[PDB]
Amino acid sequence: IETVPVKLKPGMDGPKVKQWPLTEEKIKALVEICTEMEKEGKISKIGPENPYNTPVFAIKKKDSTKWRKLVDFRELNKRTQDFWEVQLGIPHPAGLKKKKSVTVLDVGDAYFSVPLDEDFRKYTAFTIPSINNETPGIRYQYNVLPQGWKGSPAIFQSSMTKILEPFKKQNPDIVIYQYMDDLYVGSDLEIGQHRTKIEELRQHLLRWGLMGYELHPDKWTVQPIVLPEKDSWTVNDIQKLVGKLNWASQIYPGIKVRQLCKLTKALTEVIPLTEEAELELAENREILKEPVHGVYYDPSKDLIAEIQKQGQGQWTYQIYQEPFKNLKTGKYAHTNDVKQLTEAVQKITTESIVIWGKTPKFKLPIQKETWETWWTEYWQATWIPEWEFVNTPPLVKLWYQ
Amino acid sequence: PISPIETVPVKLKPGMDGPKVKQWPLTEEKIKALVEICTEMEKEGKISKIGPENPYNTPVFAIKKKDSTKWRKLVDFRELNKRTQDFWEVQLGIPHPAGLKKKKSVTVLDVGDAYFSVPLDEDFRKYTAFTIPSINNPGIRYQYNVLPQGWKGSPAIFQSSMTKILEPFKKQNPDIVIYQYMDDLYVGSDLEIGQHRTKIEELRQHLLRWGLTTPDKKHQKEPPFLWMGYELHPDKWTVQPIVLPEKDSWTVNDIQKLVGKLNWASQIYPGIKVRQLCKLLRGTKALTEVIPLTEEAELELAENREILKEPVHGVYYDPSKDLIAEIQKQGQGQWTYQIYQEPFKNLKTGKYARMRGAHTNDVKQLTEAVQKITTESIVIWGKTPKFKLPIQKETWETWWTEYWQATWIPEWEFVNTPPLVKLWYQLEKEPIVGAETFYVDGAANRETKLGKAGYVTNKGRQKVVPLTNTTNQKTELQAIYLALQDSGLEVNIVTDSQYALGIIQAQPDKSESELVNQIIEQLIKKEKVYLAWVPAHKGIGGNEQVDK
Ligand SMILES: O=C1c2ccccc2C(=O)N1CCOC(=S)Nc1ccc(Br)cc1
């Protein structure tokens, strides 16, 4: 029946964002993928009386050759904020992360059922561009729950709950989280049965539709910080040692870089093992294979993700809210920098989404213009996190090497 | 006429209402005029008389038109405009002649009284009310039924109004290309003389059925064309005639215009430098100032005037064929490039100087250009071109891999245009056996601008120069530099401040900064340099000592 009187944040207008210049194949795809959609009544053109705009891209499923259309409601979401968050937002089960394995299900084509609050349809305006701007460019609007939009789940919520009732009822141990367009379900059931239970779940959906993605958070554990083991030891090697310990010292309340640091000298000159500095590495090594004591997750502040590139298709990433207060730190491994990072990001995000229920702020070690040109090609997720390009400090890259 | 097209529901902003602005008396004939004009527009329906009920009004003045001796009705809507709404941007981007597919026959049509031919929204006409004064404050007032000239939504609505009015006919003729730039229709087809002119009388009728008039049968226009600074033939394209009248004295202005004209010609004219002409534009100059033409300039202008001599021409696009794009090193921070499909018949040229960044090495500079060109090719031809570059697949690999940041060029080949791009020096992966260890350091009094940059050594040595007006961020790039001169060819250096490390750590091969520069040649001279860092002010052998 009638829709949820969607209401924006007083003291702000809709979004108005330029359309990315898109390749021929993405434009083709979108125009077709969009002709039907209106046909299907899910959208309809719009007059010039609509100032608003949102970017949109085309992506491919799981490497598959079928184009999925991706709208970037990144902005709009901020404008709706309080509504989808402090209004009807869905809570987050700390249970998820704990399950032995979690499948991620794309259940967003469901929204295209529920109707969008008419008076709110204008905000969802987007635009299919044109090669060399030789023709104006088709302009559309949503008259239903859009996908990449954070407003959709909050609304569809109530429905979703009901759809899941019976199932959940029959296995009060499966934990179903919901974050934009996708459903996260976890269970400690050996794989076979999990896969079963998920496929079984699939079935419920089908009807309300008016195995898969195997992910196992349980086996996650913070990437330690390693200090070489050597056997020779020279100024340089020991000089770097402390340098690192200097950084460590920073965080990890307890780090001790004295006996070592206290040991002029010639660079290439090798030396021994300090009678009783051994306990330095020994003791220090310890607290490093450890989780930063004193660091906790603040829900009121948002998450921040940092990635540095270490040659050899290797990448190290830390997650924190307060510089040098790491909550998470891991790594990740047609070979191009851009693709790999794009993957790392998605990887990081997911984990983040599974741990805290929100996406981090990314600091991408790359030229904006370049990322801002290629990311789509290897992008598959149905969400888009916040990012900001930077220049990697020198030693850093090393300290996490 | 007034198009029978549907209307666009216009609207005001939320907490706002119509415009009401005192209409201040006009002069004798100005009135006479405005009355004459208005009578006609009404005689057609452009306007219609409103009672005294309409609370709303916007000022209206006339103005003598230079041509012949006629007045023109002119109505500032500043108010009705400030109070109106926002519209889908009319401005978004112009095509580029190079992006255009090649057509056989082509003709432009200009639209009669466009604006006054599109019917404004009924429920909005009330807000356009304006008043023709009496020789001295009885009154007489009108309203708009069509799009007012200086309004605000007028542009948008028109553009929209026309796309549709054009929609069908297009469906009817999928092969045709129509482009809409203001009071102008550009029509292109590969069909020849015979069925093109006929193909037009067609469009003409179509446009008429929808209320728009056009130039006469034998009363139109043919290429070359002028448009946004271009000259457009149905097979080729160029920038419009660019003249440089001879002159001995150039005002700051003169040359700005010069530089401007020149930067434009570079879309199609290969080999146009304006670098020694931008120098000349250095400092708080005052437009009217006369500037001497430092040798470089003069030389330029000529080689510029030369290249210009011969008229040149870009070609159009062939969707089937690939896009070849090949860059060239043109000298210290300057890069030129051409894009083409066949022998060497460019579709467009272009250049690149965007040398932002403090310290930079060719490689990067070169890559940056690829990016630049990449995006550019994407919007014009909806696809990325294959690249041919003045760099060895290897010299690149070596770089991109050791480098911290992320990169990715599309597909490219090596060319041998002999200003090849290379790494002018390499740091040392590990320390160096039998090399003076240099614990360097730069200091300074934070409140006097005086410090001291010295260095020790595992070999007993010791030194310290007297630094005048330098910040840590400069004395440090001096603790090093020093250690570069007093050491042999193979050294070990050790500084604090990631800063110094940062910059050097990044094999930069030229900087806007003499000092760094120096410390560059120094390296290009050496034969083995290892750069190491340590926790600034701590109890560390070496660094401690130097700390005095
Ligand atoms: O006719 C025009 C224009 C005229 C001026 C500026 C832009 C265009 C345009 O996109 N179109 C439609 C496409 O035209 C194409 S594909 N090819 C042309 C068109 C017109 C000429 Br003179 C030469 C080549």
Q: Chain B: give the shortest CA distance to residue A262, in Å.
A: 7
A235-252 CB burial, b ≥16 within 10 A, e <16: bbebbbbbbbbbbbbebb
| Helices and strands of chain B, counted as H and E runs | 13, 23
SS3 of chain A: helix, strand, coil, percent, to 5 = 35, 15, 45
Please name the residues in contact with A174: beta carbons below 8 A apart, sequence gap of 6 or more.
Answer: A167, A168, A185, A186, A187, A197, A201
Beta-bridge partners for B493 = B438, B531
Closest of B522, B316, B403, B229 to residue A311, by C-alpha: B403
Of B536, B511, B544, B519, the C-alpha closest to B427 is: B519
Q: Which residues pair with A67 in a beta bridge?
A: A60
- What is the three-state SS of B273-315? CCHHHHHCCCCCCCCCCECCCCHHHHHHHHHHHHHHHCCCCEE
Q: CA of A246: which chain B residue's CA is closest?
A: B535
Q: Which of B279, B226, B287, B229 is nearest to B257 (CA)?
A: B287
Q: Could you give the CA distance from residue A168 to residue A175 in angstroms, rounded to a whole number?
A: 8
- Which residue has 């054009």 as its token pair? B166
**Which mutation among B96, B232, B313, B380 tests ligand 1's pocket best, with the greatest number of atoms within 8 A of CB?**
B232
B122: exposed, middle or buried (C-beta count within 10 Å: 0-12, 13-18, 19+)?
A: exposed
Question: DSSP label at A91?
Answer: P
Across the A:B interface, residue pairs with CB atoms under 8 Å apart total 180
Cβ atoms of B391 and B420 closer than 8 Å: yes
Work out whether the CA dihedral A264, A270, A276, A280 comes out positive or negative.
Answer: positive
Question: For residue A3, which amino acid is it?
Answer: T
The 10 Å Cβ neighbour count of residue A298 is 11
Tell me if B232 CB under 6 Å of ligand 1.
yes
Angstroms from B459 CA to nearest CA on chain A? 8
Q: Where are the alpha helices (DSSP H) in A227-336?
A: 235-250, 278-288
**Using CA atoms, how far apart are residues B477 and A342, in angstroms rounded to an integer?**
37
Q: Enumerate the β-bridge partners of residue A176.
A: A185
Residue in this structure with the two tokens 């419920």, named with its chain if needed: A204
Question: CATH for A87-111+153-224?
Answer: 3.30.70.270
- Three-state secondary structure call for residue A355: helix
Does A262 contact B at CB distance below 8 Å?
yes
CA A326 to chain centre: 17
Look-up of token digits 């009678």: A275
Q: Are B395 and B421 in contact (CB under 8 A)?
A: yes
Containing B157, the helix (H) or strand (E) segment is helix B154-172
Kindly compute the dihedral angle of the four CA atoms of residues A26, A32, A33, A35, in this order, to the nearest 10 degrees.
140
Nearest residue on chain A to B404, judged by CA atoms? A309
Contact predicate B235/B316, CB 8 Å: yes
Which domains are assigned to chain B? 1-90+116-154 (3.10.10.10), 91-115+155-223 (3.30.70.270), 224-317 (3.30.70.270), 318-424 (3.30.70.270), 425-548 (3.30.420.10)
User: Is some CB atom of chain B closer than 8 A to the CB atom of A311?
Assistant: yes
Other CB atoms within a 10 A radius of the CB of residue A358 amount to: 15
Q: Which residue has the tokens 């250095």?
A: B282
* Interface contact flag, A243 B535, Cβ < 8 Å: yes
List the single residue in B88, B431, B544 with the smallest CB-CB distance to A267. Answer: B431
Q: How many CB atoms lie within 10 A of CB B230?
A: 19
Q: Is A338 an 8 Å CB contact of chain B?
A: yes
At B9, which amino acid appears? P
CB < 8 Å from B in window 216-235 of A: 234-235
Angle at alpha carbon of residue A65, lines to A61 and A70, rounded to 5° = 40
Cis status of the peptide bond prior to A172, with omega within 30 of 0 = no
Q: What is the dihedral of CA B46, B48, B53, B56, to 10 degrees?
A: 20
DSSP code at position A219: G
- CATH number given to A297-401: 3.30.70.270
B254 marked as part of a ligand binding site: no
CB contact under 8 A, A366 and B94: no
- Phi and psi based region of residue A137 (left: phi greater than 0; alpha: psi -120 to 50; beta: remaining): left
CB count in 10 Å sphere of residue B356: 7
Q: Is residue A395 within a helix (H) or strand (E), and if so which, with residue range?
A: helix A394-399
In this structure, the strands spanning A214-215 and A101-106 are antiparallel
Are A1-86+112-152 and A225-296 the same fold in CATH? no
A134 lines ligand 1 (CB under 6 A): yes
Two tokens at B527? 């034969």
Name the strand (E) or helix (H) holding A56. Answer: strand A56-60
**Length of chain A measured in residues:** 401
Hey, what are A70's tokens?
Answer: 């991706």
Judging contacts by C-beta atoms under 8 Å, the chain B residues touching residue A365 are 404-406
Domain ranges of chain A: 1-86+112-152, 87-111+153-224, 225-296, 297-401
For residue B338, give the H/E element and its range.
strand B335-340
One of 3.20.10.10, 3.40.50.1970, 3.40.190.10, 3.10.10.10 is the CATH number of A1-86+112-152, namely 3.10.10.10
Calpha distance B247→B292 (Å, rounded): 12
The alpha carbon of A309 is separated from its chain's Cα centroid by a whole number of angstroms, namely 18
**Token pair of B346, please?**
């460019």
Distance (Å, whole) CA B414 – CA B207: 53
d(CA A85, CA B148): 45
C-alpha B100 to ligand 1 mean position (Å): 6
Helix (H) or strand (E) holding A207: helix A191-208
* B55-82 core/surface letters (b: 16 or more CB in 10 A; e: else): ebbbbbbbeeeeeeeebebebebebbee
Q: Which amino acid does the sequence have at B356?
A: R
B547 is in an annotated binding site: yes
Tokens of B252: 């700051």
CA separation for the pair B78, B489 (Å, rounded): 72
Rounded to an integer, what distance in angstroms lies between the CA atom of residue B537 and that of residue B535?
6
What's the topology of domain A225-296?
Alpha-Beta Plaits (3.30.70)
Q: Are B512 and B472 in contact (CB under 8 A)?
A: no
Q: Is the C-beta atom of B324 inside 6 A of ligand 1? A: no
Q: Is B76 flagged in the annotation as binding?
A: no
- Residue whose entry in the numeric block shows the structure tokens 């009638």: A2
3-state helix, strand, coil in chain B (%, to 5): 30, 20, 50
Q: Are A49 and B505 an interchain contact pair (Cβ–Cβ within 8 Å)?
A: no
Instruction: Give me the amino acid identity at A203.
Output: Q
User: Are the C-beta atoms of B413 and B387 separated by less than 8 Å?
Assistant: yes
Q: Considering only alpha carbons, which residue of chain B is nearest residue A248?
A: B535
CB-nearest to B371 from A135, A243, A370 is A370
CA–CA distance, A124 with A72 (Å, rounded to integer): 10
Alpha helices in B185-267 (DSSP H): 193-209, 252-265
d(CA B294, CA B273): 15
What is d(CA A285, CA A260) in angstroms, rounded to the nearest whole number?
Answer: 13
CA of B268 to the centre of ligand 1 (A): 18
CB B190 within 8 A of CB B103: yes
Helix (H) or strand (E) holding B180, with range, is: strand B177-180
* Declared resolution, Å: 3.0
Cα B220 from chain centre:
33
